[PDB]
Design a protein around this ligand. Structure first.
Ligand SMILES: CC1=C(/C=C/C(C)=C/C=C/C(C)=C/C=C/C=C(C)/C=C/C=C(C)/C=C/C2=C(C)C[C@H](O)CC2(C)C)C(C)(C)C[C@H](O)C1
Ligand SMILES: CC1=C(/C=C/C(C)=C/C=C/C(C)=C/C=C/C=C(C)/C=C/C=C(C)/C=C/C2=C(C)C[C@H](O)CC2(C)C)C(C)(C)C[C@H](O)C1
Ligand SMILES: CC1=C(/C=C/C(C)=C/C=C/C(C)=C/C=C/C=C(C)/C=C/C=C(C)/C=C/C2=C(C)C[C@H](O)CC2(C)C)C(C)(C)C[C@H](O)C1
Ligand SMILES: CC1=C(/C=C/C(C)=C/C=C/C(C)=C/C=C/C=C(C)/C=C/C=C(C)/C=C/C2=C(C)C[C@H](O)CC2(C)C)C(C)(C)C[C@H](O)C1
Ligand SMILES: CC1=C(/C=C/C(C)=C/C=C/C(C)=C/C=C/C=C(C)/C=C/C=C(C)/C=C/C2=C(C)C[C@H](O)CC2(C)C)C(C)(C)C[C@H](O)C1
Ligand SMILES: *C/C=C(C)/C=C/C=C(C)/C=C/C1=C(C)CCCC1(C)C
Ligand SMILES: *C/C=C(C)/C=C/C=C(C)/C=C/C1=C(C)CCCC1(C)C
Ligand SMILES: *C/C=C(C)/C=C/C=C(C)/C=C/C1=C(C)CCCC1(C)C
Ligand SMILES: *C/C=C(C)/C=C/C=C(C)/C=C/C1=C(C)CCCC1(C)C
Ligand SMILES: *C/C=C(C)/C=C/C=C(C)/C=C/C1=C(C)CCCC1(C)C
Lengths: 254, 254, 254, 254, 254
C-alpha cells in the first residue's frame, strides 16, 4: 500500500475521532431529548439513538483499525500489513440504513399502510447492502465483471427507496402543516445528498481512481462527513419534526 | 488447525462485530421502550434487556478470543495455539435460554399455573444446556459414545420444551385477539427455526463434517445469525406483543 | 504451583466469565425492576443492585488475574509466578456481606429496634471478614496455630449472625402473610446453604486438602456458584418478597 | 523536541487528568440536575451535558497521546517521536464551540429571531474553527504568511461572535430581572476572558515564543484551565440562570 | 526505592481495589437514592454522587499507577522507576474537598447568607489544596524550609474551615430537630477525624518518618480508609440527614 505522510495519517485519525465524538454526543442528546417531545413521537427518537449508538461502536472499531494499519517509521507512516478496507463498514450499514428509514416512517405517523411501506423499505435497504457486499470484496482489476454486476443489482433497491421517498411519501407530506412540510422536504434532500456519496465511492473504486495517498485520505474524510450528516444531523432533523408536531397538537411536555 | 485466508478471517470477525452491535442496540431499545408499553408488561421487557445484555458481554469476549486465535503471517491467518471452541458459548446459553422462555411466559400473562409452567420450562432449559456441555467437550473421534449419549440426553428436555410451547400454550394463545395470536404463533415459529440450529451444529461436529476453513467460517456466521435472530429479533417480537396487548386494554401511555 | 490441562484452565475461565455475566444481568434487573415494586421497598432493591455491582467489578478483576496467573506452553497451562489466591476475595466480602444482611432487614420493615438489629448485624459481618483475613494469609503448614485461632475467632460472629437470623427474626417473620413467610424462610435457607461454603473451603485449606489441579478447579467453580447464588439469586428473592408485599398492601404500580 | 524533567511531565499529566475528571463530573451534574429546573430550560441543560461529554472523550484521548509522546529514560522524559500537537484539539472545538453558544441562546428564550441569531452564531463558530485549522498545521517558520493569513481570516468570525454577544444580546439581557441580568453579564465576561486564551496561544506559536520545556508545560496547563472554565463552569452558570428563571416564573419542581 | 514483599504489594493493591469498589457502589447508591428523599434535598445528593464519581475515576488511575510502579522479580516486588507519589492525589482533592463542604451546606438549607458561607468555604478549600501542592513536591531534605512554609500557609484555610464548621454552623444546627442535630454533629465529628489524616501524613513525610516498606504500605492503606470514610460514608450521612428532613416536613415520596 502507499506510504502516508504525518499530516495524511493525522487527518484521517482526526476525522475518525470526530465521527466517534459526534455519535456519542448524538446518542446522549436523543436519549435525553426523548422526554422533551410528546409521548406519541418518543419511539421514533428511540430508533434515532440506536442508529448513533451502533455507528458509534463501529467507528470506535474503525479508529482502532486505522492506528493498527500503519506504523511510524523515519517520519513516514508505513503500512503494517494489518488489513483496512471499506468492507467492515457494510456491517454497520446493514443495521443503520434500515433503522434510518424506520425513524422517518415512525415520526411521519402514516394514516394507512404504514406497516407495508416500512416493511418494503426495510427489505429494500437490507437487499441493497447485501448485494453491495459481494461486489465490494471483488477485486476491481481481476474481477471487474462481478463488481459491475453486484453494483448494478445493488442500485435497483436504492432507486426503489428513492422512488418511495419522493412518490409514495408525497401525499403523506402534503397532509402536514407548512413548518413540518419544510422540515420533511429538507430531510428528504439530506438523504439524497448524503446517500449518493457511497455509490460514488464504490464506482470510483471500480474505475481504479482511488489509488494514492490523497485519494485514501479523501475517502476516509468523506466517509466521516457523510456518516455524521446522514446519522447525527438526520436524527436532529427527526427530533425537530417531532418537536414541531408535538407543538402543533399541544402534546409538548413544557 | 486449518489456516484461514484473509477473507475467511475477515468474514468471521465482521459477523462477530455484527452480533456485538446488534446486542448493544437491542439492549438500548428494550431499556428505552419499556416506558412505551403499559406498566403490566414492563417486567417482560426488562427480562428481554437482560438477555441481550448478557449475550452482548459474551460476544465481546468471543470476538476477543477470535483475534487471539490467529496471527497474520505471509498473507495467511495461522492459528496461534490459543484455544477457540464452542464450549464457551454454553456459559452464555445457561443464562439466556432460561430467560428467553421466561419473557415469553411473562408477556403471555397465564391465568392459571403460570409459576409451575415457568419453573418447569426453566428447569428443562438448564438441564438441556447442562447435559449438552459434557458431550461438547467430548472428542468426536476418541469419545464418540459419550458425545452421542450426552446429546441424546440433552434432546429430551429440548423435546419437552417444544411440547410445552405447542401443546400447553395452545389454549392460552387461543384466548388472545387475532393480532396477538398471529404475533404469538410467529414467535413460536421463530423459536423452532432458530433453536434447531444448535443441535444440528452439534450433530455435524459429531459426524466430523466441520473440518476445513469453509466449515469453520460457516459455523461462526451461523452462530451469529442464529443468536441475533433468537435474542434481538425475538425480544422485538416480545415488545410487539406487549405493545399490542397495551393497545387492546387501553393501558398504552401515549 | 501445579500445571493445568487445557480443560481445567478453560473450566475455571468459563465459570469466572459466568459469574461476571450473572452480576451484570442482576445489576440491570435490580435497577430496572426497582420501579416495578411499591415505593416503600425500592431502597431495599437499591442495596441489592450495589451488591451485584461491587461483586461484578471484583469478578472482572479476578478473571483478569486468572488469565495472568498461567501461560499456554506445550499444550499445558504453566504458572507464570503472578499471584492468584483467595485473599483478594475478602476485599469483596467486607462490602457485600454487610450489604446482603442490610437488604434483608430493609425489605422486612422491622416494626421496632430495626436500627439496633441492622447495626449489630453489620458489625458482626465486618468483624467476621476482618478476623478471617489474617488467618487466610497464614501459611497452613508453618503457621497452623495462627490460622486455627483466626478461623475460630471469625466463626463467633458467624454464629451470632445465624442466631439473629433464626431466633430474633422469627417473631418478625411470623407477622407476615403465608406467601411472604414462605419466601422469607426460603431466603434464610439459601443463606445457610451458601454461606457455609466459605468456612468449609477455609477449613479444607487449613488441613492441606486443596493441593492438586482438581481441587484448584473445584474451589474456583464452587466460589463462582456460591457467589452467584448468594448475591444474584438472593437479590431475586428480595425482589420477590418486595413484589409480594407491594401486592399485599395495594402499592403495586401496575 | 525538548526533553522534560519528571516534574514537567507530571504537571502536564496531572492537569490532563484534572480536565478529564472535571468533564466527567460536569456531565453527571448536568444530566441529574436537568430534573431540578423547570421543563422549559431542560433542553438547554441537555446541550450543556453534550459539551462536557464530547470534551471529556477528547481529553481522554489527549491524555493517552501525552503518555505515548514521551518515554522515561535516565530520570528524564525523552520524546518517542509519536506526535503531540494542538491540531487534534480543533476536532473538539468544531463541535463544542457551536454548542456552547447554542446553550446560551437556549437558556435566554429570545422572543424574536431566535433561529436566525442561533444559526448565524453557529455558522460563525464553525467558520472560525475551520479557518483556524489550516494556519495551525502551517509551520510558523517556513509558512509564516499562510499562518498569518489563516489567523486573520479566523479572527473575523470571532469578532462577529463578540459583537453579537455584546450588541444584539444587550436588549434581550435588559428584559430579565436583576439576578438573571447579573448572571448573564458574568457569563458574557467568562466567555471573553476564557475564549481569548486560544488566539493568544496561536499568536505566541506564530512568533516562536513556545519553544522550551517551560512553555510546553505552561501551554498544556493553560489549555486544561481554559477548557474547564469555558465548558464545566460555563455550564454551571447556565444551570444557575435556568434555576433562577425557573424560580422567577414558579416552574421550579421543588 | 525500597523493595516490597509479596504481602506488602498485595495489601496496597487490595486496599486500592477496595477504594475503587467503594466509590462505584457509593455512586450507584446516591444516583438511585436521590429519588427516595424529598425534591428539596435532591440537589445535595447530586453533589454527593459527583464526589464519589470523581474520586472513583482517580482511584482507578492510582491503582493503575501502583501496578506500573513495581515488577515481580525473584519473589520480591522491585521498583521499575515509573513514578508513584502523593502529588497526583492533590488533583482529586482540588475538586472533591470543595464539593464535600458544598453538599453539607446544601442539605443544611441555611436561612440567611447561604451563598456567602458556601463561597468562602469553597475558596478556603481551594486555597488549602493549592498552597499544599508546592510543599508536597518539595524534597523534605534539600527543601525543608519551602515544605514547612507551604504546609503552614496551607493550615490557615484548614483552621478557617474548622472554625466555620464549629462556630458559624452551630446556630444553624441548633434550629434542627434532635435526630437531625445528632446526625449533623456526627457528620462534623467524621470531618475532623478523617480530614486530619492528610496533614499528619504530610508532617510525617516532612520529618522523614515515611521511609521503609512498612510505612509505604501503611500510608496507602490509610489513604484508602480516609478517602472511603470522608467520601462514601460522608455521603451516606448526607443521605441520612436528607431522609430525616424529608420525613420531618412530610415530603418523603413513600
Ligand atoms: C454509475 C455506477 C454505479 C452507481 C452510481 C450511483 C447510484 C450514483 C448515485 C448518485 C446520486 C443519486 C447523486 C445524487 C445527488 C443529488 C443532489 C446533488 C441533489 C441536490 C439537491 C439540492 C442541493 C437541493 C437544494 C434545496 C432546494 C432545491 C430546496 C430546499 O427547500 C432548500 C435546499 C435544500 C437548499 C454502480 C454502483 C452501478 C457501479 C458502476 O460501475 C458505476
Ligand atoms: C440427530 C442428532 C441429534 C439431534 C438433532 C436435533 C435435535 C435436531 C433438531 C432439528 C430441528 C428441531 C429442526 C427444526 C426445523 C423446523 C422448521 C424448518 C420449521 C419451519 C416452519 C416454517 C417455515 C413456517 C412458516 C410459516 C407458517 C407455516 C405460518 C406462519 O403464519 C407464517 C410462516 C412463519 C411463514 C443429537 C444432538 C442427539 C446428536 C446425534 O448424533 C444426531
Ligand atoms: C470446623 C472448622 C472451621 C469452621 C467451619 C464452619 C463454620 C463450617 C460451617 C458449615 C455450615 C454452617 C454448614 C451448613 C449447612 C446447612 C445445610 C446443608 C442446610 C440444609 C437445609 C435444607 C436443604 C432445607 C430444605 C428445605 C426445607 C427443610 C424446608 C423448605 O420449605 C424447603 C427446602 C428449602 C427444600 C474453622 C473455620 C474454625 C477452621 C477449623 O480449622 C475447622
Ligand atoms: C494578534 C494576533 C492574532 C489574534 C489575536 C487575538 C484575537 C487576541 C485576542 C484577545 C482577547 C480578545 C482578549 C481579551 C481579554 C479580556 C479581558 C481581560 C476582560 C476582562 C474583564 C473583567 C475582568 C471584568 C470584570 C468584572 C466586571 C468589570 C463587572 C462584573 O460584574 C464583575 C467582574 C467579572 C469582576 C492572530 C490570531 C490574527 C495571529 C496574529 O499573528 C497575532
Ligand atoms: C504540625 C505540622 C503541620 C500540620 C499538622 C496538622 C494541621 C494536624 C492536624 C490534626 C488534627 C486536626 C487532628 C484531629 C483529631 C481529632 C479527633 C481525634 C477528634 C475526636 C473526636 C471524637 C472521637 C468524638 C467522639 C464522639 C463524641 C464526643 C460525641 C458524639 O455524639 C459521639 C462520638 C462520635 C463517639 C504542618 C502541615 C504545618 C507541617 C509541619 O511540619 C507539622
Ligand atoms: C450511515 C450509513 C449510510 C447511510 C450508508 C449508506 C449506504 C449506501 C446507500 C450504499 C449504496 C450502494 C449502492 C447504491 C450500490 C453500490 C453498493 C453500495 C452498497 C455502496
Ligand atoms: C441465544 C442462544 C440460544 C437460544 C441457544 C440455544 C441452544 C440449544 C437449543 C441447544 C441445544 C442442544 C441440544 C438439543 C442437544 C445437543 C446439545 C445442545 C446443547 C447443542
Ligand atoms: C458474596 C460473598 C459472601 C456471602 C461471602 C461470605 C463469606 C463468609 C461467610 C466467610 C466466613 C468465614 C468464617 C465463618 C470463618 C473462616 C473465615 C471466613 C472468612 C471464610
Ligand atoms: C472549549 C473550547 C473552546 C471554547 C475553544 C475556543 C477556541 C477559539 C476561540 C479559537 C479561536 C481562534 C482564533 C480567533 C483565531 C486563531 C485561530 C483560533 C482557532 C485559535
Ligand atoms: C477526599 C479527600 C479529602 C477530604 C482530602 C483532604 C485533604 C486535606 C484536608 C489536606 C490538608 C493539608 C493541610 C491542612 C496542610 C498540609 C497540606 C495538606 C494539603 C495535606
Amino acid at each position: 500500500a502507499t506510504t502516508l505522510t504525518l499530516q495524511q495519517f493525522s487527518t484521517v485519525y482526526n476525522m475518525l475521532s470526530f465521527a466517534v465524538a459526534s455519535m456519542l454526543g448524538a446518542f446522549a442528546f436523543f436519549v435525553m431529548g426523548r422526554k422533551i417531545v410528546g409521548p406519541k413521537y418518543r419511539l421514533a427518537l428511540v430508533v434515532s439513538s440506536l442508529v448513533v449508538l451502533i455507528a458509534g461502536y463501529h467507528y470506535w472499531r474503525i479508529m482502532g483499525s486505522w492506528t493498527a494499519a500503519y506504523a511510524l517509521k523515519d517520519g513516514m507512516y508505513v503500512p503494517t500489513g494489518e488489513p483496512f478496507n471499506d468492507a467492515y463498514r457494510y456491517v454497520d450499514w446493514l443495521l443503520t440504513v434500515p433503522l434510518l428509514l424506520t425513524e422517518l416512517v415512525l415520526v411521519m405517523k402514516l394514516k394507512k399502510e404504514s406497516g407495508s411501506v416500512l416493511a418494503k423499505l426495510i427489505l429494500a435497504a437490507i437487499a441493497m447492502i447485501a448485494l453491495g457486499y459481494p461486489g465490494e470484496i471483488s477485486n476491481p482489476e481481476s474481477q471487474a465483471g462481478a463488481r459491475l454486476m453486484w453494483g448494478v443489482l445493488s442500485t435497483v433497491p436504492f432507486l426503489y427507496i428513492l422512488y418511495v421517498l419522493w412518490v409514495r411519501l408525497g401525499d403523506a407530506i402534503g397532509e402536514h402543516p407548512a413548518k413540518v412540510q419544510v422540515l420533511l422536504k429538507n430531510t428528504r434532500y439530506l438523504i439524497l445528498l448524503t446517500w449518493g456519496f457511497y455509490p460514488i465511492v464504490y464506482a470510483m473504486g471500480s474505475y481504479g481512481w482511488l489509488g494514492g495517498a490523497g485519494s485514501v485520505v479523501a475517502v476516509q474524510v468523506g466517509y466521516s462527513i457523510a456518516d455524521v450528516t446522514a446519522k447525527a444531523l438526520y436524527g436532529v432533523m427527526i427530533f425537530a419534526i417531532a418537536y414541531a408536531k408535538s407543538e402543533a397538537d399541544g402534546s409538548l411536555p413544557a
